[PDB]
Symmetry: C4
């Protein structure tokens, strides 16, 4: 708990060399994961690189293990460690989507470098003051998604045949991407007043967005 | 007016249980209205759900009735109640567009939950300081819509054949959606100087938009 | 100069009735110009409406004449009058583009209604603090327009064959409209490194835009 | 170092006539470079204009030479001169991409006119406070670019077959250009859950952008 061998390990994990080594590895596994992208490189130096990968996964597990010895329950209430935990855990399951999620370990460069932690933490910090407006927005989407599903799903199954599909399309209308040439004008060929649904939608959603952003600037 | 039975009802509508019950119903009729979206679910449990729907419509009418007993003319000068009124009234007419408008009762979650009321009320509050710029903008749209109708409606009836059609297209140009690839470049094949109409339009409309948004930030 | 008949006319133009009458006409000629949009209406009540139009043009010329008697050289240093002048002058030439420009007289509702004048004047007021950045931007466009004309005009004459054409396309890239799917990806089929031209362009132009807008907010 | 002939040259380069002459040339070589765009003009007055071009290149080399005599090592620590240096150097190599880069000398109008220098310098000044967020963003792009390359490169080689290609597409998704109609909806025909990759991408990238812009406004 504060004994002979505890304090030995503690002085290692807390050493700058520990951090730097880990950061050094992250930038290295980073570059390695970008070259693994090339089947040319993969064909030649490929096995070299599978090697470096479990090496790094092992080093990271050892590290995480140590960090829990040194920190115990303090470790499992730290966001930055919990991230490092789950990211490294993912990289330990041997469903290809998990093989790809391995790349999430590169986000450890964020947890590791305090300049980054501080940046991310600044960004995350404005989200709580947004929840109420975001709650309002989601209700809005949900309601309009229902309305659109049953107004247009039958003739327009791809875009609106399903509550989820309508959610997708409504998000696309919010981003303004092809909303008129690709969605609303087609609808109007069948539903001449469809414009009464999407223009108010676009007005509300955009007004909310601007205010949401004025919200952020309301602290500064 | 302040009698024996009046004060009895008053203590019920004003009870927290009343509010919570109503909110409870709203979240329930909400989920129900999302499952009604699926013809699978509709095929199986469908009648169960038509049931829950008039049940809720009845409960809501009773509630609204009570709330007017307790509030009388104060009720009909409250936005939040007037909304609840009109929304529930809609849900009472038996034109499919009214069947769909029933979903508007889910917005009662806004009127009911004071955190939401406050949010919405914040948003709505900035609109009056915008009316003058919005008035200016609409005049602008109207004038340019007339000009475009008669400059391009004859060769381009779909986009500009009608004052309303031109309004629609001009709105789409304002959102910047396909303005060049899908509208102005086609026009230029017939009207080489059409760019003299839409670039200034896009300049004015965008300048106004930014200032409109600086307007909001002019209080904060 | 300040005589018997001068002061008589002066009391008329300066009367509220004068202003209101003019405003009344503007809203009327406004509605009339929107109905002239319909060949149906035009077919039936059409001549009624050509009538109301020169009537109003005459009334407006008389008014402008009076206003110069009452104001003399003060009139020709007022923006709002100079506008009214040029707009009404246009409406007096009998080239269809002038027939359409007649609709610009509806902007007299702006000059006439002081709430509008004040709004417009607020908007116009931020433009001088932008000129320097706008000068920078235009130079930027000019230079990149030259570069693009000679990098891509030969294989891509429609988009870049001409300094003006390149100006048009570059403006479209700035608005982000189809910049990749419709312009840059096509170019890359011939010029694989074209992305080195348009991504920096899009970066600079967007950075400038944001700062231009922060500029406005730098007073507030 | 501060001798007879040194101080003679010094009084010339530091003269207002020197600056004005140079500026005069820049506006002239500017106009000339825009007319060189027309093969009509090129066909007729073309050689006149190749002439004016080396004339100006020579004058500029002489100038730069002088300015280094007058300034020595102070010259090579000035951004504005270093620019003028490299821009003029480019214009001295006789690979067509260098023939086009000659047009970069028009940016000397920026270095020369102090109102511009000040503007540019204002703009550049906000960039250092952005580096941390920009670092975060680039890491984000890199990681998602890797993930997309291996999730979609095989079936969608054009958009994602290569780390660079995925970088390009991800940038396009960030600008929101055709992200749904032209990229994600096509992907979903093969990968129904692709929406789980690009919506969070679009959320993060947009949130960061707004905060990056609130950053700028955080000084004002
Ligand atoms: C999603 C929305 C989440 C909303 C949460 C908002 C509330 C919140 O927790 O924000 C404030 C906190 C402050 O934590 P902080 O005080 O920085 O924690 C330091 C702990 N210490 C001293 C023991 C090292 O902020 C944090 O705790 C930061 C949490 C960071 C999470 C890990 C992110 C790593 C992935 C990289 C993401 C890249 C995005 C571009
Ligand atoms: C005030 C009220 C608050 C209510 C909050 C809770 C809402 C809960 C959502 C309800 C669940 C709806 C699920 C559902 O019906 O799924 C539909 C479809 C699959 O149905 P399926 O039977 O396969 O459709 C057949 C297709 N057809 C018609 C073309 C032949 O599959 C999908 O589309 C999947 C569903 C995706 C959408 C989920 C949206 C969650 C929104 C949360 C809003 C929170 C507001 C605060
Ligand atoms: C300010 C910000 C305001 C945000 C408002 C809410 C934005 C929601 C964004 C749109 C979500 C979306 O893509 O919906 C699709 C899903 C799944 O539908 P699904 O039918 O599975 O897939 C449709 C496409 N398909 C058939 C080709 C596979 O549909 C769902 O399952 C609904 C998911 C709702 C997520 C709510 C997120 C709240 C904020 C984080
Ligand atoms: C925020 C609130 C937003 C409210 C949104 C309401 C949108 C209503 C527009 C719906 C629409 O345009 O299309 C759906 C229906 C059905 O089209 P329908 O006219 O039946 O076309 C049938 C064509 N056929 C025979 C070839 C199949 O089209 C119609 O039947 C529409 C007829 C006019 C509807 C007018 C609704 C006015 C707004 C009411 C909102 C009250 C306050 C919230
Ligand atoms: C300073 C002046 C202020 C004036 C303010 C008041 C303006 C009032 C609007 C005038 C009414 C115009 C109605 C009208 O002409 O409707 C046209 C069309 C249907 O005409 P129709 O005869 O069916 O066209 C035949 C089609 N064709 C030529 C291709 C064979 O149907 C439509 O397009 C319907 C009309 C939709 C547009 C309504 C716009 C309202 C703008 C309000 C601006 C307020 C400014 C403060
Ligand atoms: C800052 C915000 C500035 C806002 C400036 C005004 C934005 C107006 C938005 C565009 C309105 C719009 O969609 O116009 C279409 C309508 C009806 O035309 P209509 O000919 O019935 O339908 C055209 C399409 N069709 C033939 C396929 C059915 O055309 C009309 O009837 C005109 C409606 C004018 C509404 C004015 C709204 C003021 C702000 C709320
Ligand atoms: C804010 C104020 C915005 C003012 C907007 C004015 C826009 C004028 C542009 C109109 C345009 O490009 O197209 C319409 C006309 C007619 O085209 P046109 O050249 O007759 O083509 C006929 C082709 N054919 C034989 C195959 C049928 O095209 C022309 O005839 C245009 C000729 C040049 C017009 C120059 C107008 C300069 C702006 C005047 C604004 C004064 C201050 C408000
Ligand atoms: C520091 C330097 C400052 C210099 C400022 C002054 C610049 C003055 C602009 C120079 C004039 C260029 C005019 C010109 O060459 O016009 C080209 C074309 C028509 O040429 P054309 O001979 O018909 O082309 C034949 C077509 N082809 C090759 C496909 C067979 O026709 C057009 O494209 C018309 C020209 C439109 C563009 C005008 C742009 C003005 C930019 C102002 C920038 C101010 C910066 C502060
Ligand atoms: C912050 C704001 C930054 C603004 C930066 C400058 C934006 C310029 C916008 C683009 C202007 C534009 O459309 O250029 C086209 C013209 C005429 O080229 P032209 O070859 O006549 O027409 C091309 C298209 N065609 C062949 C189908 C007829 O090309 C020209 O003649 C050039 C016009 C330059 C106008 C400069 C305006 C300064 C700001 C007001
Ligand atoms: C702010 C400053 C912005 C500077 C913008 C420079 C843009 C250069 C890119 C030009 C480009 O991608 O395409 C033009 C040329 C010619 O393509 P090319 O490779 O000749 O393709 C010929 C294909 N064929 C045989 C079928 C006809 O493509 C090439 O030859 C490009 C080769 C690489 C150019 C690298 C330029 C690096 C940037 C230099 C900037 C210095 C600081 C301002
Ligand atoms: C925390 C970790 C930090 C790591 C930072 C350092 C990252 C260094 C990047 C790694 C280098 C990757 C180069 C590479 O693999 O190039 C791939 C391709 C050409 O490969 P190739 O063998 O031709 O592909 C064959 C094509 N196929 C499969 C369809 C038959 O060619 C390309 O696509 C060229 C590569 C372009 C992308 C360069 C991106 C630099 C991102 C910098 C991020 C900084 C973060 C702070
Ligand atoms: C806030 C701002 C956040 C900025 C985040 C980063 C934005 C990066 C923008 C996208 C860069 C880009 O276009 O990537 C393409 C290149 C070269 O890939 P390459 O495979 O050579 O070309 C792909 C297209 N092709 C096959 C038709 C020639 O791919 C690369 O080589 C990667 C270049 C990375 C540049 C990083 C710039 C940092 C900021 C300045
Ligand atoms: C910030 C964090 C962002 C994380 C992004 C994860 C994105 C995952 C989605 C990938 C996707 O939609 O497509 C790739 C795979 C493979 O598609 P697959 O289903 O194999 O389709 C094969 C079709 N066939 C036979 C004709 C070839 O599709 C799948 O297999 C997807 C299956 C569901 C994946 C669920 C992932 C949930 C998110 C995990 C994030 C954890 C926290 C960072």
């Amino acid at each position: 708990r504060g004994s002979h061998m505890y304090l030995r390990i503690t002085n290692i994990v807390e050493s700058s060399f520990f951090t730097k080594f880990i950061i050094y590895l992250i930038v290295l596994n980073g570059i390695t994961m970008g070259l693994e992208t090339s089947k040319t490189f993969m064909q030649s130096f490929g096995v070299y690189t599978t090697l470096f990968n479990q090496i790094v996964i092992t080093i990271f597990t050892i590290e995480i293990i140590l960090r829990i010895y040194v920190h115990r329950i303090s470790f499992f209430k730290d966001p930055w460690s919990l991230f490092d935990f789950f990211v490294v855990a993912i990289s330990l399951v041997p469903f290809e989507i998990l093989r790809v999620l391995r790349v999430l370990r590169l986000f450890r460069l964020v947890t590791a470098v305090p300049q980054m932690r501080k940046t991310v933490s600044a960004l995350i910090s404005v989200i709580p003051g947004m929840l109420s407006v975001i709650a309002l927005m989601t209700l809005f989407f949900y309601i309009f998604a229902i309305m659109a599903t049953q107004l247009f799903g039958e003739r327009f199954p791809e875009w609106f045949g399903t509550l989820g599909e309508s959610f997708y399309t409504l998000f696309q209308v919010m981003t303004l991407e092809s909303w008129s040439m690709g969605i609303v004008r087609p609808l109007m060929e069948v539903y001449p007043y469809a414009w009464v649904f999407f223009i108010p939608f676009i007005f509300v959603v955009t007004f909310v967005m601007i205010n949401l952003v004025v919200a952020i600037i309301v602290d500064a």
